[PDB]
Amino acid sequence: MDSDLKAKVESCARTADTFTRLYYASVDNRRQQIGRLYLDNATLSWNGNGAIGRQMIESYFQELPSSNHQLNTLDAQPIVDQAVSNQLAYLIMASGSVKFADQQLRKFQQTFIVTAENDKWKVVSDCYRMQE
Amino acid sequence: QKNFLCDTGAYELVGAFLENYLREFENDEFRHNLYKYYSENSIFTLTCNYNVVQTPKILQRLSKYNRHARNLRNKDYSKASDGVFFGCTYIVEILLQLPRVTHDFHSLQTDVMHYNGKGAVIYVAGLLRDEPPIGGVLLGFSRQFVVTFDEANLGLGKRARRLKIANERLHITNPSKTAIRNA
């Protein structure tokens, strides 16, 4: 396709990989600092249970059992201008398996939308779904 | 089963868009008629995370999705375009090669994540049956849609919204024992 769309898709793929790597290491290994990755006013939806704004997101995570995530699938699209213009946005899914403390092993799909504060990418939305 | 709702104004857009779009994807014969939702700037990817565990049957049926699937986990950043379908013609072209399905509408979990006058972000998690033109296959799936709202220009000067899909991902995966139980 167009050599600039190629550049936009490829840039997005690198960001999505850097972000998800660090994100999934923060939830498993440093949940104390998990809030730092959300915008002040982000939406979280953990299995259809909403948490709006970091303060409230940041206390959902502190009340969740300890976790270990195995990633297997990563996907990122750059978001079309009209969906949210003047802020370039990435639509990232991560899927795999997760082991919560004192719970059966499960599968998960996590779908973020991220934008940039300065040089750092943070969550605008996050939809988490467990399966097994 | 819990559904998330952004805004209570978005409520009857779940049934209107998601449950009409899904029903019309179902029969692959009339699936070309989804050309209307997509635009010149539309983007579609397909991901497949199905752990195989009737093994030859499974792998030949899942290949229908896999042959188009995209995954950047451990991939070389140059091949990042591999799997990305761009523009209405190209998207509908991939969508017409996928198998026939029947979604289990009772199984569907909804997450509306944004909603305004410009548009919405809407995710569905559910169970569908993959059907052959050989045997039936239950699959897990996710569909995520970034959609925009544009004033339809019928001639009556009454404001109306046409839905367009800007971003689109189908995800194929294992059904959960609970869904299989209750299909």
UniProtKB/Swiss-Prot annotation, chain A:
SUPFAM superfamilies: NTF2-like (SSF54427)
Keyword annotations from UniProtKB, A to Z: mRNA transport, Nucleus, Protein transport, Transport
Domain of life: Eukaryota
Phenotype upon gene inactivation: RNAi-mediated knockdown in the germline increases transposon expression.
Subcellular location: Nucleus; Nucleus envelope
GO biological process assignments: defense response to Gram-negative bacterium; negative regulation of innate immune response; poly(A)+ mRNA export from nucleus; protein transport
Principal location listed in the UniProt entry: nucleus
InterPro entries attached to this UniProt entry: NTF2 (IPR045875), NTF2-like_dom_sf (IPR032710), NTF2_dom (IPR002075), Nuclear_transport_factor_2_euk (IPR018222)
Tissue specificity remark: Expressed in female gonads (at protein level).
NTF2 domain segment(s): 15-130
A cellular component term, taken from the record's GO annotations: transcription repressor complex
Description of how the protein assembles with itself and partners: Forms a complex with RanGAP, Nup358/RanBP2 and sbr/Nxf1. In the ovaries, part of a complex composed of at least Panx, nxf2, piwi and Nxt1. The complex is knowns as Panx-induced cotranscriptional silencing (PICTS) complex, Panx-nxf2-dependent TAP/p15 silencing (Pandas complex), SFiNX (silencing factor interacting nuclear export variant) or piwi-Panx-nxf2-p15 (PPNP) complex. Interacts with nxf2 (via NTF2 domain); the interaction is direct and prevents Nxt1 binding to nucleoporins. Interacts with sbr/nxf1. Interacts with Nup54 and Nup58.
PANTHER family found in the cross-reference section: NUCLEAR TRANSPORT FACTOR 2
Function: Stimulator of protein export for NES-containing proteins. Plays a role in the nuclear export of mRNA. Also plays a role in the nuclear export of U1 snRNA, tRNA, and mRNA. In ovaries, plays a role in transposable element silencing regulation. Forms a complex with nxf2, Panx and piwi which acts as effector of cotranscriptional transposon silencing. In ovarian follicle cells, enables the nuclear export of flamenco (flam) transcripts and subsequent piRNA biogenesis.
The name this protein goes by in its record: NTF2-related export protein
Swiss-Prot record, chain B:
Protein name: Nuclear RNA export factor 2
Domain notes: The RNA-binding domain is a non-canonical RNP-type domain. The TAP-C domain (also known as UBA domain) mediates the interaction with Panx.
Residues of the full protein shown: 573 to 769 of 841
Cellular component aspect of the GO annotation: cytoplasm; nucleoplasm; nucleus; RNA polymerase II transcription repressor complex; transcription repressor complex
Cell location: Cytoplasm; Nucleus; Nucleus, Nucleoplasm
All copies of domain NTF2, residue ranges: 13-172
Record text on subunit structure and interactions: In the ovaries, part of a complex composed of at least Panx, nxf2, piwi and Nxt1. The complex is knowns as Panx-induced cotranscriptional silencing (PICTS) complex, Panx-nxf2-dependent TAP/p15 silencing (Pandas complex), SFiNX (silencing factor interacting nuclear export variant) or piwi-Panx-nxf2-p15 (PPNP) complex. Interacts (via TAP-C domain) with Panx (via NIR region); the interaction is direct. Interacts (via NTF2 domain) with Nxt1; the interaction is direct and prevents Nxt1 binding to nucleoporins. Interacts with sbr/Nxf1.
Disruption outcome: Results in sterility where fewer eggs are laid and none reach larval stage. Increases transposon expression. RNAi-mediated knockdown in the germline does not affect ovary morphology but results in severe fertility defects where eggs are laied but do not hatch. RNAi-mediated knockdown in the germline increases transposon expression and impairs Panx localization in nurse cells by reducing its stability.
Molecular function via GO: chromatin-protein adaptor activity; RNA binding; single-stranded RNA binding; transcription corepressor activity
Keyword Transport: yes
Main location: cytoplasm
